[PDB]
Symmetry: C2
């Protein structure tokens, strides 16, 4: 079941990465307009955090409602259950989930991927996008059995 | 336990889809035409969800373009035994058209379905009934694989 859970998330992340890549390289729109559009889409997922990094490795944008996920990417553990690799496990940060009162499932465990995105300057992608998807529901199911 | 867990995964996704589309269809600043245009723009982007919107008389006003109207499969709907509470159904159709071929092609013909009243009120009753169907084929592929 662990490999199945990894495949579920990888499918989701593949789709999310395609959507956000297209957003960040949408023709005839400024950076401001693209980041506004991206934030609205990311907010719509409700179980996703992102961070956008420049060529030096400085964060130009990250999602509200949580600390920058780049503060947890350097101690990310490679995911053993992801065949093909390039998927990482994050032990934080905790994401705020308002609107439901007390007892909502905690979102502080993630599967992470990253890819080059954004307009080319020149022929070369300016940004690197980090995408984190909550895996806490997976981890609670596994922990509750044992 | 894993079947019940798969149901709860789906129910959670359906809850969020329900809340998003509910806001869209009774958004205070917009006309009914603008709201439906917003619905269609959002819904067309879905990879694994079909929806159908019925009017006051139970006639379909809108449904997703990738497949036949899911309300045509209401007559074959089975209560979801793994959904322990509420009104969740299992549909064994329709097939949703998906892009690509080979290993990359997504086979989507099995659904968990819910419905709710939606839209602005007329005579103290919402004008629409929204039907939402989420793909469960990946759940079934896993279970059928274990059974050999
Ligand atoms: Ag969250
Ligand atoms: Ag899970
Ligand atoms: Ag589909
Ligand atoms: Ag599954």
């Amino acid at each position: 079941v662990k490999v199945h859970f990894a495949e579920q998330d990888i499918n989701d992340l593949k789709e999310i990465s395609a959507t956000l890549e297209r957003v960040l390289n949408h023709p005839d729109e400024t950076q401001a307009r693209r980041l506004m559009t991206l934030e609205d889409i990311v907010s719509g997922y409700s179980n996703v955090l992102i961070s956008l990094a420049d060529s030096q490795g400085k964060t130009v944008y990250h999602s509200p409602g949580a600390p920058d996920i780049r503060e947890f990417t350097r101690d990310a553990i490679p995911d053993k259950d992801a065949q093909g690799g390039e998927v990482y496990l994050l032990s934080g940060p905790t994401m705020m989930m308002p609107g439901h009162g007390h007892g909502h499932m905690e979102h502080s465990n993630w599967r992470m991927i990253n890819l080059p995105v954004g307009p080319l300057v020149d022929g070369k992608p300016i940004y690197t996008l980090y995408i984190a998807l909550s895996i806490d529901f997976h981890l609670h199911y596994i922990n509750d059995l044992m």
